[PDB]
């Protein structure tokens, strides 16, 4: 519908809080996470991205299970059966209820719904790849038990499904339909269940921090371990020889307990954010001393036990909150630098492996409010500058070692840093203060080189031409400053009619654009120091903007929930897109091929293909109402 | 650090205070004077960016008089701009430099001239003796 941009894919998505599944991969294992309406499959021993489901489900995936080489994904009243990210079959349950839980075992598929029904599907022939024929519908009436919490199959329990509810534990024979067992009432609410590696035993977690070892055959407790003032969210048994139990909690802690020594082994504190559900799943890999953990904070971590407290091994993740600032890190379209209000700085790969890595800050730094990066001096010295909220100094980072750098750059006028910039050569860093000063630092030695004082209000933008001749600045005072870099002379001043909130400088054309509080975009020629164009159209605050690499276009985003393309030779809007999720960032790839956008909701970065590498006709309400790119692509 | 047409001046660089002593004196004196400036005119010459600084000073010695004078010359600004960053300017030391050599010839590197060469002739060099056989 848009004439310029077509949705490509989304970067930086790993997990959303749905408990991940584990399956068999030849000799190794695979991990299935949820991203929303898409699942992703990783290798368990490398965390390499193996698959992503090729086609989005109509609604959000609620449950994931893996059985051999098949993934079962529940959404609405449906269960999708996938192999290699490709849907091989779709089960539509005869109900308007939603599927909540899944259990696949023997010739059976069991899917419980939110009205306490359990739909049972069966293989026609045992050598079928998956169950497909509806067999029966069990129901747990409120007298038989409480709300269904989990469906489990214990080892050697032929044709027998264990249905754990909030108040009790039931045993159904799914072949005959008979309820063969129902335990005594449990006093405290059951929240979690997990088959033990020995006969007849299932582990049950409660709302109170109790893990109960329950014997299904005799129908009695065998053991009850108390975890003080914790709410259990996951259970898993180690199975490599050591009789250990892991207990995840909603507060984000992972507790390791020795079943034989009856003592607390250890506790990994706050490995996942509590506000996102803490530990939503934690699983020991079968036969291995490795535990895989996840939460709703978009991370997937792996912990090992060396032949001793567990040691961090590897992990994959992205931001837990929407990205606040982004930038292309290089001209080969390899990495993107991305900052979020979760106080993290990440580098995301744009390539197929979807690799990513958080910038080491070696309790986090305050949230980033401005960002600049240049690839010129990578490996040689610091090549990233960040401004942080309410801090009077900018920090530096090293893109080569993915770690914070040596220098901090003070404003010198007791103001906060409100803008940062870098020379193309990578030799200089620029810092703009809330008190008006502009400071120029040496990226190699960290030394203060030069100081300018023109603005009397916050400097909201700074840049320097590719030849380091003329430096330009903007501020909330509505002033545009022009300075000689080699000396320190004020080359000129412009007074604009509204406060200026941001600047983007186009080095190959020496034009720079400014976002003003009057909702216009002002384009200025740095050589002539004159306004050459003014763009009017947006009906709300401008969030971001960028030049197309050639210099012909400017693309802008706004609170009005639009993304507009402006042709500079005419100053007219030649394309407009209406999104349902406001764009907070827009950046062109160094080569004109891609457009990166960040939005109010969503942890990732949207990639768009510029399919116009066009008419000059004006538009109005002919804007396209486009959706964001699919998480199922690539 | 800079020698001049058979002479040679050495450079001292590490931040300090006033009184920059040449040889072991004071670029107040430097008494082969007359053109005693062009010495105090490197420091004065600092007229382009700096005013005097707050650093160091070293000794010269080679060949003869005006030679030396011209040597101590480069000697100085050929040592303000000293690398840097502990001497020159911790960044963009073209600060001085290109300025302290947009009208220079001392710090402006040295001159490719240097005494030698004669001739089986008269005085030698080129001036070959005056003979007029009849």
Swiss-Prot record, chain A:
The keyword rRNA processing is annotated on this UniProt entry: yes
GO term, biological process aspect, one: rRNA processing
Keywords: Acetylation, Nucleus, Phosphoprotein, Repeat, Ribonucleoprotein, Ribosome biogenesis, rRNA processing, WD repeat
A GO-annotated cellular component: small-subunit processome
Highest taxon of the lineage: Eukaryota
WD repeat residue numbers: 21-52, 62-92, 100-139, 149-182, 189-226, 233-268, 276-317, 324-358, 369-408, 417-451, 459-495, 500-535, 537-578, 580-614
Cell location: Nucleus, Nucleolus
Function: Involved in nucleolar processing of pre-18S ribosomal RNA and ribosome assembly.
Swiss-Prot/TrEMBL domain comment: The WD repeats are grouped into two tandem seven-bladed beta-propeller regions.
Note in the entry: Present with 2020 molecules/cell in log phase SD medium.
Subunit: Interacts with snoRNA U3. Interacts with MPP10. Interacts (via WD repeats) with UTP18. Component of the ribosomal small subunit (SSU) processome composed of at least 40 protein subunits and snoRNA U3.
Name by which UniProt lists this protein: U3 small nucleolar RNA-associated protein 21
Gene (UniProt): UTP21
Span of the entire protein shown here: 20 to 684 of 939
């Amino acid at each position: 519908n848009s004439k310029i941009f077509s949705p490509f894919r989304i970067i930086g998505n790993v997990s959303n809080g749905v408990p991940f599944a584990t399956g068999t991969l030849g000799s190794t294992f695979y991990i299935v996470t949820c991203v929303g309406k898409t699942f992703q499959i990783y290798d368990a021993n490398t965390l390499h991205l193996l698959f992503v489901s090729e086609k989005e489900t109509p609604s959000s995936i609620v449950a994931l299970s893996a059985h051999f080489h098949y993934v079962y994904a529940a959404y609405e009243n449906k269960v999708g059966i996938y192999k290699r990210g490709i849907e091989e079959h779709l089960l539509e349950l005869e109900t308007d209820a939603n599927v909540e839980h899944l259990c696949i075992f023997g010739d059976y598929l069991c899917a419980s719904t939110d009205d306490n029904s359990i739909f049972i599907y069966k293989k026609s022939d045992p050598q079928d790849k998956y169950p497909s024929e509806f067999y029966t519908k069990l129901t747990v009436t409120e007298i038989q038990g409480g709300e269904i919490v989990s469906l489990q199959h214990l080892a050697t329990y032929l044709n027998k499904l264990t249905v754990v509810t909030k108040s009790n534990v039931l045993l159904f024979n799914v072949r005959t339909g008979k309820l063969v067992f129902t335990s005594n009432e449990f006093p405290d609410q059951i929240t979690t269940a997990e088959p033990a590696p020995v006969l007849d035993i299932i582990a049950l977690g409660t709302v109170t921090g109790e893990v109960i070892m329950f014997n299904m055959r005799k129908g009695k407790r065998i053991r009850t371990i108390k975890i003080p003032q914790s709410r259990i969210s996951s259970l898993s048994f180690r199975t490599d020889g050591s009789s250990h139990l892991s207990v995840g909690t909603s507060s984000g802690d992972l507790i390791f307990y020795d079943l034989d020594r009856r003592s607390r082994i250890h506790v990994l504190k706050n490995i996942h954010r509590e506000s996102y559900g803490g530990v939503t799943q934690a699983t020991f890999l079968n036969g291995q001393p490795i535990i895989v953990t996840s939460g709703g904070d978009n991370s997937l971590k792996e912990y090992v036990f060396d032949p001793q407290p567990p040691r961090y091994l590897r992990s994959r993740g992205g931001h837990s909150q929407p990205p606040s600032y982004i930038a292309f890190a290089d001209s080969q379209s390899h990495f993107m630098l991305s900052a979020s209000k979760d106080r993290s700085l990440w580098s995301f790969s744009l390539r197929k492996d979807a690799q990513s890595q958080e910038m080491s800050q070696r309790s986090k730094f305050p949230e980033i409010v401005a960002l600049a990066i240049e690839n010129a001096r990578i490996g040689e010295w610091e090549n990233i500058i960040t401004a942080h909220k309410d801090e009077k100094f900018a920090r530096t980072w090293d893109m080569r070692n993915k770690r914070v750098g040596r220098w901090t750059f003070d404003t010198t006028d007791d103001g906060f840093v409100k803008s940062v910039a870098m020379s193309q050569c990578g030799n200089f860093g620029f810092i703009g203060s809330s008190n008006g000063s502009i400071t120029i630092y040496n990226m190699q030695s960290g030394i203060l080189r030069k100081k300018y004082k023109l603005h009397k209000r916050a400097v909201t933008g700074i840049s320097l031409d590719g030849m380091n001749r003329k430096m330009v600045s903007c501020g909330l005072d509505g002033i545009v400053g022009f300075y000689d870099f080699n000396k320190s002379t004020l080359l000129g001043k412009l007074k604009l009619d509204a406060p200026i909130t941001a600047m983007v400088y186009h080095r190959s054309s020496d034009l720079f654009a400014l976002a003003l509080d009057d909702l216009s975009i002002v384009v200025i020629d740095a050589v002539t120091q004159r306004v050459v164009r003014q763009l009017w159209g947006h009906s709300n605050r401008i969030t971001a903007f960028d030049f197309s690499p050639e210099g012909r276009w400017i693309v802008s985003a706004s609170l009005d929930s639009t993304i507009r393309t402006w042709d500079l030779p005419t100053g007219g809007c030649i394309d407009g897109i209406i999104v349902d999720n406001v764009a907070t960032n827009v950046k062109f790839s160094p080569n004109g091929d891609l457009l990166a956008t960040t939005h109010v909701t969503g942890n990732g970065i949207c990639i768009w293909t510029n399919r116009a590498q066009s008419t000059r006709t004006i538009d109005e309400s002919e804007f396209a109402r486009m959706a964001l790119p699919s998480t199922s692509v690539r | 650090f800079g020698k001049k047409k058979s002479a040679t001046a050495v450079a001292h660089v590490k931040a300090g205070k006033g009184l920059i002593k040449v040889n072991g004196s004071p670029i107040t004196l430097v008494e082969p004077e007359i053109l005693r400036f062009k010495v105090y005119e490197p420091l004065l010459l600092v007229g382009l960016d700096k005013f005097s600084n707050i650093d160091i000073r070293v000794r010269v010695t080679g060949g003869g008089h005006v030679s030396q004078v011209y040597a101590i010359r480069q000697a100085i600004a050929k040592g303000l701009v000293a690398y840097h960053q502990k001497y020159v300017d911790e960044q963009s030391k073209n600060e001085l430099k290109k300025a302290f050599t947009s009208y220079d010839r001392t710090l402006l590197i040295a001159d490719s001239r240097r005494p030698e060469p004669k001739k089986f002739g008269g005085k030698g060099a080129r001036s070959r003796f005056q003979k007029s056989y009849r």
